[PDB]
Amino acid sequence: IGVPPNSANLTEARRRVFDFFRAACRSIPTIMDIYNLQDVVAPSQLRYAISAQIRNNAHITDPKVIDLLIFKGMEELTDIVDHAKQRHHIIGQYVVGGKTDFLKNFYTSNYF
Amino acid sequence: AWRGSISKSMKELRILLCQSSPASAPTRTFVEKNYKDLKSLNPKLPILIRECSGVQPQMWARYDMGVERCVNLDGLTEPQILKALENLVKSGA
Amino acid sequence: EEHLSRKVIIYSPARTATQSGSGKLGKWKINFVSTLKWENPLMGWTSTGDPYANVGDSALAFDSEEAAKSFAERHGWDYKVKKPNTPLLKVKSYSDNFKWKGNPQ
Amino acid sequence: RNPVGGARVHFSNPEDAIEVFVDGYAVKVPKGFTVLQACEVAGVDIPRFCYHSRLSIAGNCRMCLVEVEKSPKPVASCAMPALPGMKIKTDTPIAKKAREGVMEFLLMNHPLDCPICDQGGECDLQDQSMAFGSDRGRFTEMKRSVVDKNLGPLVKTVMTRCIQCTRCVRFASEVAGVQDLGILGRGSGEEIGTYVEKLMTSELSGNVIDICPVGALTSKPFAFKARNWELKATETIDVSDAVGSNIRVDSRGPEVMRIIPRLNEDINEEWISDKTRFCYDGLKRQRLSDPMIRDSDGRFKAVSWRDALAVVGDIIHQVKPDEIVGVAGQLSDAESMMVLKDFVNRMGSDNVWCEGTAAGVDADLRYSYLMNTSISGLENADLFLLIGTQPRVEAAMVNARICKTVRASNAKVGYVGPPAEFNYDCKHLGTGPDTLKEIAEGRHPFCTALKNAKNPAIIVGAGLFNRTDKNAILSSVESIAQANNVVRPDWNGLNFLLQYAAQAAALDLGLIQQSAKALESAKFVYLMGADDVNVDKIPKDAFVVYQGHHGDKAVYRANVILPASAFTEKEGTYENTEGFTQQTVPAVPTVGDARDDWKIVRALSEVSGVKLPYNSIEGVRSRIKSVAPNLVHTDEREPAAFGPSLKPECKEAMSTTPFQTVVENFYMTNSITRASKIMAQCSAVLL
Amino acid sequence: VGNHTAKWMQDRSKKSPMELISEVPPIKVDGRIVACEGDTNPALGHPIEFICLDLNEPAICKYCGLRYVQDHH
Amino acid sequence: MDNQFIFKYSWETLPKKWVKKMERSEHGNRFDTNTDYLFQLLCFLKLHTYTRVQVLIDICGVDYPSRKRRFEVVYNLLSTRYNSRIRVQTSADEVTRISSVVSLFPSAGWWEREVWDMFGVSFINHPDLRRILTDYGFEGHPLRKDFPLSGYVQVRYDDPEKRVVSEPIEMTQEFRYFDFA
Ligand code: SF4
Ligand code: SF4
Ligand code: FES
Ligand SMILES: [Zn+2]
Numbered sequence A: 001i002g003v004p005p006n007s008a009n010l011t012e013a014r015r016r017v018f019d020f021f022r023a024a025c026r027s028i029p030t031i032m033d034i035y036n037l038q039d040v041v042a043p044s045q046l047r048y049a050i051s052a053q054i055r056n057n058a059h060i061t062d063p064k065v066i067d068l069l070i071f072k073g074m075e076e077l078t079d080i081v082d083h084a085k086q087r088h089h090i091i092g093q094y095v096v097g098g099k100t101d102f103l104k105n106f107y108t109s110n111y112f
Numbered sequence B: 001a002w003r004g005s006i007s008k009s010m011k012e013l014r015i016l017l018c019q020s021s022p023a024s025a026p027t028r029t030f031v032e033k034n035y036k037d038l039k040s041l042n043p044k045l046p047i048l049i050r051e052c053s054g055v056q057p058q059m060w061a062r063y064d065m066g067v068e069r070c071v072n073l074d075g076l077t078e079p080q081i082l083k084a085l086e087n088l089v090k091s092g093a
Numbered sequence C: 001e002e003h004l005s006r007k008v009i010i011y012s013p014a015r016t017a018t019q020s021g022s023g024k025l026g027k028w029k030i031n032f033v034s035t036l037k038w039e040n041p042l043m044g045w046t047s048t049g050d051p052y053a054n055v056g057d058s059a060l061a062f063d064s065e066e067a068a069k070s071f072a073e074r075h076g077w078d079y080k081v082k083k084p085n086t087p088l089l090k091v092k093s094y095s096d097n098f099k100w101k102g103n104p105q
Numbered sequence D: 001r002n003p004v005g006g007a008r009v010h011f012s013n014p015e016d017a018i019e020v021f022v023d024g025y026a027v028k029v030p031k032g033f034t035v036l037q038a039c040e041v042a043g044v045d046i047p048r049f050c051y052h053s054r055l056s057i058a059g060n061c062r063m064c065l066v067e068v069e070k071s072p073k074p075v076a077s078c079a080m081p082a083l084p085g086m087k088i089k090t091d092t093p094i095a096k097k098a099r100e101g102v103m104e105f106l107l108m109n110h111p112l113d114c115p116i117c118d119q120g121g122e123c124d125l126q127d128q129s130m131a132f133g134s135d136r137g138r139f140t141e142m143k144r145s146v147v148d149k150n151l152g153p154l155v156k157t158v159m160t161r162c163i164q165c166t167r168c169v170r171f172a173s174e175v176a177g178v179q180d181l182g183i184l185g186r187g188s189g190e191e192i193g194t195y196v197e198k199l200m201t202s203e204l205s206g207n208v209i210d211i212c213p214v215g216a217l218t219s220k221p222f223a224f225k226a227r228n229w230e231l232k233a234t235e236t237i238d239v240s241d242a243v244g245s246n247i248r249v250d251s252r253g254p255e256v257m258r259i260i261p262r263l264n265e266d267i268n269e270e271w272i273s274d275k276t277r278f279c280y281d282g283l284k285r286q287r288l289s290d291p292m293i294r295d296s297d298g299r300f301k302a303v304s305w306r307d308a309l310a311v312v313g314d315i316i317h318q319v320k321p322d323e324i325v326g327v328a329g330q331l332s333d334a335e336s337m338m339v340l341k342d343f344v345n346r347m348g349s350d351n352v353w354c355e356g357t358a359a360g361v362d363a364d365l366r367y368s369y370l371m372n373t374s375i376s377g378l379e380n381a382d383l384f385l386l387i388g389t390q391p392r393v394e395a396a397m398v399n400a401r402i403c404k405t406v407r408a409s410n411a412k413v414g415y416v417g418p419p420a421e422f423n424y425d426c427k428h429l430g431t432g433p434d435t436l437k438e439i440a441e442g443r444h445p446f447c448t449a450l451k452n453a454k455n456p457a458i459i460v461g462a463g464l465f466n467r468t469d470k471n472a473i474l475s476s477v478e479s480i481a482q483a484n485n486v487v488r489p490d491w492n493g494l495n496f497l498l499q500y501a502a503q504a505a506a507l508d509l510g511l512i513q514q515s516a517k518a519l520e521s522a523k524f525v526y527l528m529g530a531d532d533v534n535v536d537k538i539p540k541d542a543f544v545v546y547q548g549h550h551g552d553k554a555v556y557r558a559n560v561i562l563p564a565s566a567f568t569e570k571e572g573t574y575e576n577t578e579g580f581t582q583q584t585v586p587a588v589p590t591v592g593d594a595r596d597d598w599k600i601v602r603a604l605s606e607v608s609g610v611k612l613p614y615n616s617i618e619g620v621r622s623r624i625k626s627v628a629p630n631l632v633h634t635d636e637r638e639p640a641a642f643g644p645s646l647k648p649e650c651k652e653a654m655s656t657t658p659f660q661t662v663v664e665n666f667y668m669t670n671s672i673t674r675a676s677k678i679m680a681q682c683s684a685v686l687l
Numbered sequence E: 001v002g003n004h005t006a007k008w009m010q011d012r013s014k015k016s017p018m019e020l021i022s023e024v025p026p027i028k029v030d031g032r033i034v035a036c037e038g039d040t041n042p043a044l045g046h047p048i049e050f051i052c053l054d055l056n057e058p059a060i061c062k063y064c065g066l067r068y069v070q071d072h073h
Numbered sequence F: 001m002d003n004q005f006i007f008k009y010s011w012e013t014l015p016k017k018w019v020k021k022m023e024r025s026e027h028g029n030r031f032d033t034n035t036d037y038l039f040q041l042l043c044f045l046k047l048h049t050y051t052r053v054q055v056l057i058d059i060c061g062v063d064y065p066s067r068k069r070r071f072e073v074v075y076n077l078l079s080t081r082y083n084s085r086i087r088v089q090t091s092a093d094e095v096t097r098i099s100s101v102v103s104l105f106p107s108a109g110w111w112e113r114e115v116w117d118m119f120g121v122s123f124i125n126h127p128d129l130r131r132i133l134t135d136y137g138f139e140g141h142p143l144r145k146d147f148p149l150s151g152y153v154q155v156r157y158d159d160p161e162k163r164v165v166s167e168p169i170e171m172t173q174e175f176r177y178f179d180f181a
Helices: A010-026 A028-034 A043-055 A063-082 A101-108 B022-041 B078-090 C065-075 C094-098 D035-041 D093-106 D124-131 D167-174 D207-211 D274-278 D280-284 D305-316 D334-346 D376-380 D396-409 D434-441 D445-451 D470-483 D503-509 D597-607 D617-625 D677-685 E017-023 F003-013 F035-047 F108-119
Strands: B012-017 B047-051 B058-062 B068-072 C007-011 C029-031 C037-039 C046-048 C078-082 D017-022 D025-030 D065-068 D086-089 D155-157 D182-184 D191-193 D217-219 D232-237 D246-251 D256-261 D292-294 D300-302 D324-328 D352-354 D383-387 D412-416 D427-430 D456-461 D494-497 D524-528 D543-548 D560-563 D573-575 D581-583 E027-029 E033-036 E049-052 E067-070 F019-023 F030-033 F055-063 F071-079 F084-092 F153-158 F163-168
Touching (some): A010 A043, A010 A063, A028 A063, A101 D597, B012 B022, B022 B047, B058 B078, B068 B078, C007 C065, C029 C065, C065 C078, D017 D035, D025 D035, D035 D065, D035 D086, D065 D093, D093 D124, D207 D256, D256 D280, D274 D677, D292 D305, D305 D543, D305 D560, D334 D573, D334 D597, D334 D617, D352 D503, D376 D396, D396 D412, D412 D434, D434 D445, D434 D470, D456 D470, D470 D494, D543 D597, D597 D617, F003 F019, F003 F084, F030 F035, F035 F071, F035 F084, F055 F108
Parallel strands (some): D017 D086, D324 D352, D383 D412, D383 D456, D412 D427, D456 D494, D543 D560, E027 E067, F030 F084
Antiparallel strands (some): B012 B058, B058 B068, C007 C029, C037 C046, D017 D025, D065 D086, D182 D191, D232 D246, D246 D256, D292 D560, D573 D581, F071 F084
């Protein structure tokens, strides 16, 4: 229930990472019915989205940073489930459902 | 005779060096001893001597279509710097 | 995320030229170079869509260069440090206003 | 304790230091410092009105009074020399009450017009009244009043506010070098003025606005436009010339409101020229905002960036490589010039240079086109020899340093060139190169004075670099330099004064005109802000592309117009005449659909089929590191590593043509100033 | 009518404040100096302004635009 | 029971390692403790016979970006028994969790939720720690000095989606900062 103490070491922190991954990913069928995503995106694509967010932070070595990231992850998850703000092609922070990149930016504006 | 043909082989020569660092000492002696003769035999060739406070000694040549070749001049003696220039002039030009 | 990769400048604002008092120097600020503003076409008011349009001058201040530098790298902002220019105190004399021109040459 | 404003103190010798006490605390100051300066070292801010660190001491406002032990009277700290064992008290009841009394006298006749006075919000008198003399007013008689005076279109006058500090009078006689302002009359009815009707014609006249502590002398074009608290301050540099004066750009929204000097002891010393201060008006006028290709009826039509770039790229491949020519403008940044040179070189062309007299010069050795003595080092010269240069109109802040040295050190000035008006005494030695032969062969009163000078200084204008006999002239100049021992390991007195902000970086990067007639045989011309080139030499059938933010004649000839950002709207690299490299800082957004200059060239190169190895400005600067590494080592002072000995011997015969004048109109020098209402007014009356 | 007034005044039925203040003739003063308060009751006017009348041209109060001239010389 | 007695009595009776700084002033007596001793010190003040600090008035954070521990957590406390007030403070950074005092003072619950919402400071053993003031799904902690006044997003009704939606901000007139310094 309560906010746990900071994880002592990386084994403790990574153990907490897997519980968050399990809890966040287990709630995909609830999210699918809440946002009516049956004809929009497959459950696996949102599972791979969560895994990708976790992998993008695999380089963090401070257990206290990991604890804060998990806590913010639980809060992001809770707001998505409990108080849904349904857009069309996003949930929360994540989008759902011959020239280099300089000319495209150049044609758009002067601020890159 | 190649020292009279740098105008016909490359469009521009650049020598980068440090004003005081010992690593740039051979390059400075090379500039102080050879620039007078090189410019005299190649009056229409820009030989740009650009000194900076913390750069490794370098040499650059600019041929056709802005194609460029560079040589690291660190750990070289002054006759070897003269040799590296002759390779730049005679090859790739 | 997207706002964390902007380039900033860490700098100490110089003294103004319209006042001889020096009681604002020593401060260090992070310039967010927010230079995207335009005119609203109903009144001509200055419109902007940059969240960091005024935070760098209003609220974000640092008492030292090191403090400003450490905060930028913790936030991920790529910064450049501009050292401030300082005056050179030179010897002045009221007596110099009456210096002898010397023997008529 | 930290000195006030972080002021640096330099000691000639530790033995030449004395000890003083400021409010008990102990400080070590050089011999000759005044009591006020010792207070500054001790981190104590003494109020002052008439004292200015760059002007002679006056001691008339009496606001700097402090208590000195064993002294019967309060001491004017700005004027009194500090002595060993001196005990200085700045917050005792005598000092506090003396300040209160003087402040009451200052406000006695001062007009009640803070709401209509532009100094409000940045006024020393308001602040020192708040802090020191917090005395309720008890003056109930009639105030004096003064009529206003006309000093020209730049300086607005409200003389009721004047507190007779005489800073403006002393500036006119010690810095500006033009004695027009004086103090007329006697008593409380003394008035600052010119007596006869006349306008301030000095190019440094706008600095009296900064030094006037009250709203008596204010900027006329800025009048009533804004309050200081609503202005955003940007710390940048000036591009009006090759001096790189440090400035502060004040803006409100997407508009520059005013430009004021910024402290830089080595360059401009908190002064700027009138062109630098009053050219900001042209930044919002006649701006190129959209890409534009001329239509069938020979009239321009706005298009997108894609359509405009395709038109230029499509036609660049229908011309021979040797017929491609690119000219960089006088306001071009180092990044844009490097990309221009890279693009032109990969299009098989070798014709890229910077507009101006120094277009086809020998840039091999950096000494040959830089002020090697340095602006701050000019103060150590006991003799100036100016050859073919008018510094007063070419580099005003450099000329200011020379005047300052002549008044203080009694240095002598020899001038060779067309007749010109100098703001300091100077012997006119001649107008053409025959004097250089005359100087070289000796037998002249100035020839022996040059030989008798300990640290001589020769300054040669860049306007003598487009002459037919530049080599012969520079050969003669070096012979005079070597003969008189002008260049030594302890003193480098040979200088070359460039005229354009872009020239120093262009020569470092390699932008040298090879073919003297490459323009008259061009089929593709890329004008990167080069509005000052003569465009009649371009063949009538040659594709011309103009990229810039303004334009008068090149816009008329261009087939395609590419709008570009100005120096107040981007981060660019600029090098001044002394090899000092600095960077601008963006202050306001760009106007219309304009783009940064290097972005247009990099974008146009990809459209033309050339791949450059950079996408961001950081890639361009790393590329510049391979060419001119000093261009990316910003804000670093570096001595020259090689000298005139490496120059080949030259045997050309000198011509007889007298030297010409480079800058005909000081106020109309670039495309920004030519789009300025104020610079137009100055050319009408101030010239 | 001027460019300054045209920025905000889109109604041409009435005269602008600039033309209205130009119509009131200069006030003649016996002496070289006059104090203007902008109102008969000073507390309801503008901050007191002292105006020198040494010039031949009418002298303008910088707050309210009233003009003053020397009566005799 | 004036501020002189509390300052002198606390110095004699408190464990020495608990307090790093003690200030007596007319602006309020103030003990600066280390993070690991905050809970025990507050329990001592509440239970001890000669202090009886029974009421937790509020908990607030202060941001000091120039400090390596930018946040300062201030506890304002009142003793109705002795008619006296005491201030206890501690420092924290963006990742250091600190002890919750809900078990000592139930009123701390919402105030600790506000500190987390406004500053991002987390509280060990807090029973229900979530945002309390900001909109659901809010990113950032607005009372931090670096957080912009107008934030990052704004809301409006979007007819095609038939709902209220969040978009990045676009101001008709930007907030004008007036520098009077
Ligand atoms: S100079 Fe202007 S702002 Fe300063 S006290 Fe006088 S009227 Fe007021
Ligand atoms: S006009 Fe200004 S600078 Fe000149 S004497 Fe009066 S107060 Fe001083
Ligand atoms: S500052 Fe010394 S008398 Fe004016
Ligand atoms: Zn009036």
